[PDB]
């Protein structure tokens, strides 16, 4: 009712922040200048999921569909199954619940039915191997996701089971100042209804890129054989570099388009991985907001994290503007002492907050 926003910008993030804040919000003039102005099927399903795993939170959408008012309640959770509509994938619906996992009355066991791949949104293995490490370093213990059947575009037929048990008061505050040394690189190429020869082709392209390096590099193959192979054919490949000492992770991934060179896809994922490593500073451009919001929701205490000049960008700016417009909270930034680069230490006081929805 009070915190006002315009347009369709960053809708999921704004809703998640509204839930964590308790401040009632109204977002209006949603894609008004369009031939089909209003909301989307995936967006309304997202709101349905929000009501499902919340309790007593009131959500209404004006008949014009360009003005949504949200009055948040509490975050119950529980165990349920959602059927993601065709246009958008399970990782896209999972990331917000991934944000909301560790602070709920009943643990999270959600079965998502549908598609598990997109150039747009994060793959299941991508989200696992990238985000699970970040949240667990912040202080969650049992968060995992299993794959009963894996879908593909555009038929879907995939089943993912998110089980998150760790209910924490707050993530432990973080003070990361340095640059982790990359320990090794692993990855995986998955194939649905297509050739192991194709798998080997893409892995050959990847290792051709990665032969310039000397530390450990391993990528596994997953032919999702048989009944749970979904319906449409497809394939994809993911790559993650790891720093065992502090245990950090950075990653990039892709799927195979229609009429594409699997070797090219290999050099693809390799090149995005390398480039993200290049632009990284103790954290990766896509998991930036995840760690940011965790360290913000941390307890009443300043927290420190190294970030990159290049990592600072439009998406960072809009995240900062939104998080300030919600929490009335501003992030201090000070340059690194070392001159060889211009890394920036971000400090921010995690707000006084508790897992007041917990069962004691």
């Amino acid at each position: 009712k009070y915190t006002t926003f315009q347009g369709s910008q960053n809708f999921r993030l704004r809703i998640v922040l509204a839930t964590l804040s308790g401040k009632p919000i109204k977002i209006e003039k949603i894609r008004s200048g369009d031939l089909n102005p209003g909301l989307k099927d995936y967006e309304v399903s997202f709101l349905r999921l929000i009501e499902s795993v919340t309790n007593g939170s009131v959500i209404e959408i004006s008949y014009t569909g360009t003005t949504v008012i949200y009055r948040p309640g509490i975050i119950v959770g529980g165990a349920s199954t959602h059927i993601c509509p065709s246009s958008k994938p399970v990782g896209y619906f999972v990331e917000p619940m991934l944000y909301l996992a560790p602070f709920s009355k009943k643990k999270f066991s959600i079965l998502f039915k549908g598609i598990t791949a997109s150039h747009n949104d994060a793959g299941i293995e991508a989200i696992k191997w990238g985000l699970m490490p970040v949240m667990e370093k912040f202080g969650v213990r049992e968060c995992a996701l299993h794959t009963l059947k894996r879908g593909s575009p555009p038929l879907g037929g995939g089943e993912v089971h998110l089980v998150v048990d760790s209910l924490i008061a707050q993530p432990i505050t973080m003070h990361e100042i340095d640059r982790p040394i990359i320990s090794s690189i692993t990855g995986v190429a998955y194939s649905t209804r297509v050739s192991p020869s194709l798998v080997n082709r893409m892995i050959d392209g990847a290792k051709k890129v990665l032969k310039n390096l000397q530390c450990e590099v391993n990528i596994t193959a997953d032919v999702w054989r048989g009944e749970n192979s979904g319906k449409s054919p497809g394939w994809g490949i993911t790559l993650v570099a790891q720093s065992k000492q502090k245990g950090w992770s950075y990653f990039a991934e892709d799927i195979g388009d229609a009429g594409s060179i699997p070797e090219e896809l290999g050099e693809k994922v390799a090149c995005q991985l390398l480039e993200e490593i290049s632009k990284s500073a103790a954290v990766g451009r896509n998991q930036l907001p995840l760690a940011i919001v965790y360290m913000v929701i941390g307890k009443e205490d300043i927290g420190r994290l190294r970030i990159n000049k290049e990592q600072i960008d439009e998406r960072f700016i809009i995240l900062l503007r939104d998080i300030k417009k919600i929490f009335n909270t501003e992030v201090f930034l000070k340059p690194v002492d070392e001159a060889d680069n211009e890394d920036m230490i971000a400090t921010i006081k995690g707000i006084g907050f508790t897992n007041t929805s917990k069962k004691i």
Partner: peptide
Amino acid sequence: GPSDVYVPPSKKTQKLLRSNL
């Protein structure tokens, strides 16, 4: 088909989906 030839992929993919006289 290397992975298909891999019977040890049972355990491997299981872990991958899990994690005198």
